[PDB]
Design a protein around this ligand. Structure first.
Ligand SMILES: CCCC[C@H](NC(=O)[C@H](C)NC(=O)[C@H](CCC(=O)O)NC(=O)[C@H](Cc1ccccc1)NC[C@H](CC(C)C)NC(=O)[C@@H](NC(=O)[C@@H](N)CCCNC(N)=[NH2+])C(C)C)C(N)=O
Lengths: 99, 99
């Protein structure tokens, strides 16, 4: 679909068997999902942005369906304010910025 | 143009007559530029990101050229790790997310 930017570009995603609301963020290199008890092997990571850093658990090869579109890659789980779909997955669903 | 996301969506901008590199950020409500001297009146404001809240100078009705496209709006100046063009200006240049 085509998403206008008058409001935050939020779409429904599915991860770990749960449906969530997520923000399509062209300014995020990574995908960060709110704290959830996702099973699997992980490694500690620190991610930054405006305001500083937050500690997250990095999960490799996690499948997430984004607005009906399947993707698979690295997902960071931690105390993020909103669910963020970054470029690592955006490229997988064929998302582009157009103007 | 159509911008894919394999690489960060960086563009050249012109603000205060000075050229800079900025990231087209669909996940940012506002446009936040690194500390710089900008002609005009400003008011103290606080914004939040992934790592926390930071203090910024809010400049209203600023003329800024984004990748050759002109926009005139709110620009926040502060300690941001990267110059970001948020939705307030992305809508002005007619940017949409597509997939
Ligand atoms: C005028 C005031 C308006 C009101 C004001 N509004 C805000 O604070 C709103 C919610 N903030 C935002 O929309 C801010 C951007 C700042 C802004 O627009 O003001 N957005 C953001 O901060 C969004 C995530 C988010 C979205 C909504 C809510 C909370 C967080 N992240 C944008 C950000 C861009 C980056 C280049 C700086 N990306 C990231 O932080 C991602 N990080 C990365 O991709 C890193 N790997 C590399 C970038 C950082 N580099 C570095 N540290 N050397 C992260 C999500 C994995 C308020 N106080 O509520």
């Amino acid at each position: 679909p085509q998403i206008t930017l008058w409001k935050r570009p939020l779409v429904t995603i599915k991860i770990g068997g749960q449906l969530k609301e997520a923000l399509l963020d062209t300014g995020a290199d990574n995908t960060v999902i709110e704290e959830m008890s996702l099973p699997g092997r992980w490694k500690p990571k620190m991610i930054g942005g405006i305001g500083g850093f937050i500690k997250v658990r990095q999960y490799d090869q996690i499948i997430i369906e984004i607005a009906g579109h399947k993707a698979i890659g690295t997902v960071l789980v931690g105390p993020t304010p909103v669910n963020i779909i970054g470029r690592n997955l955006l490229t997988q669903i064929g998302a582009t910025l157009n103007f």
